[PDB]
């Protein structure tokens, strides 16, 4: 079956409009995807957005002890048929991991997993899991008790995961504001996904935003 579903590999990200420039063949003033701004100069285009911050925090930390049991079976089941506290898992590439003020790493109540090949335990003192590659990621999950695995960045981790059909659902936030960006959310065959949750329009500091949730067909 689908690994993505078996291990509930959901992806969450936040994008904003892209502030143009007056130079470069990279300018896409008419890109069909209005919200593709992911990062810039190693950080978030926008300013710490309180709301999304809260949203992201909420969603990635929420766990339902009961509903878990079902998932417990699903995985076990697959595990065997293949062989023939309770927190969520967060996963991020080195970049985004560094892009975080140490004072917030690792992320609380969440099993942190950093994807990288240039990091070692001697280097990372935080209590996190250092993964070699998506494959290991899978191997890791297989033997790990958690609610749902989350992919919180960055652009490469998304792409890779998407290209391998490892994303069950995507929690896509949208920040209505243009900001200079050098990193953008990767493309994919959206055909397999259908929006399942469209939140209302929220407001903060004067910048609008909303939350979407696309699911695999």
Ligand X SMILES: CCc1nc(N)nc(N)c1-c1ccccc1
Cis before residue 106, ω within 30 degrees of 0? yes
Q: Is 162 in the site for ligand X (CB under 6 A)?
A: no
Q: Interacting stretch for ligand X, rule CB under 6 A, among 73-81, 92-100, 109-117, 122-130?
A: 92-100
Is position 13 an interface residue for ligand X (rule: CB under 6 A)?
yes
Q: Confirm if 35 and 194 have CB atoms less than 8 A apart.
A: no
Report what 118 binds from ligand NDP, ligand X, none; CB cut-off 5-8 Å by kind: ligand NDP
Between 30 and 104, whose beta carbon lies closer to ligand X?
104
Minimum distance between the CB of residue 117 and ligand X, rounded to whole angstroms? Answer: 19
Specify the DSSP class assigned to residue 108. T
Distance between CA atoms of residues 13 and 155, nearest Å: 9
Nearest 5°: phi and psi at 58?
-55, -70
- Name the CA dihedral angle for 131, 48, 200, 61, rounded to a multiple of 10 degrees: 40
In the set 107, 128, 155, 170, which binds ligand NDP (CB under 6 A)? 155
38 binds, options ligand X, ligand NDP, none, Cβ within 5 to 8 A by partner type: ligand NDP
> What three-state secondary structure class fits 53?
helix
H/E element holding 184? Answer: strand 183-184
| Pair 10, 168: CB distance under 8 Å | yes
Among residues 61, 156, 165, 207, which is the contact residue for ligand NDP, using CB under 6 A?
156
Residue 128 sits in the site that holds ligand X (CB under 6 A): no
The residues, any chain, with a CB within 8 Å of residue 108's CB and separated by 6 or more, are 61
* Site for ligand NDP contains 119 (CB under 6 A): yes
* Residue 16 found at the interface with ligand X (CB under 6 A): no
Instruction: Report if residue 96 touches ligand NDP, rule: CB under 6 A.
Output: yes
- Residue 4 CB partners (closer than 8 Å, separation 6+): 165, 166, 167, 168, 216
- Contacts of residue 54, defined as CB under 8 A and 6 or more positions apart, other chains included, come to none
Binding mask 49-78 for ligand X (x = CB under 6 A): ---xx--x----------------------
CB of 80 to ligand X, least distance (A): 33
8 interacts with ligand X by CB under 6 A: no
Chain positions contacting ligand NDP, by CB under 6 A: 13-14, 38-39, 42-44, 92-96, 99, 115-119, 133-134, 152-157, 160, 183
Chain positions contacting ligand X, by CB under 6 A: 12-14, 52-53, 56, 92, 96, 99-100, 152-153, 173
């Amino acid at each position: 079956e689908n690994l993505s579903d078996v291990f509930d590999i959901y992806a969450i990200c936040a994008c904003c409009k892209v502030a143009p420039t007056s130079a470069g063949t990279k300018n896409e003033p008419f890109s069909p995807r209005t919200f593709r701004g992911l990062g810039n100069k190693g950080t978030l285009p926008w300013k710490c957005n309180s709301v999304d911050m809260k949203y992201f925090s909420s969603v990635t930390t929420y766990v339902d002890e009961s509903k878990y049991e079902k998932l417990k079976w699903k995985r076990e089941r697959y595990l065997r048929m293949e062989a023939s506290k309770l927190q969520n898992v967060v996963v991020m590439g080195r970049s985004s991991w560094e892009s975080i003020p140490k004072q917030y790493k690792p992320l609380p109540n969440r099993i942190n997993v950093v994807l990288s090949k240039t990091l070692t335990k001697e280097d990372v003192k935080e209590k996190v899991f250092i993964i070699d590659s998506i494959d290991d990621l899978l191997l890791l999950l297989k033997k790990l008790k958690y609610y749902k695995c989350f992919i919180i960045g960055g652009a490469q981790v998304y792409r890779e995961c998407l290209s391998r059909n490892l994303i069950k659902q995507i929690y896509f936030t949208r920040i209505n504001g243009a900001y200079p960006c050098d990193v953008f959310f990767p493309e994919f065959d959206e055909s397999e996904f259908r929006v399942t949750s469209v939140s209302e329009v929220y407001n903060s500091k004067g910048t609008t935003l909303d939350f979407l949730v696309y699911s695999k067909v």
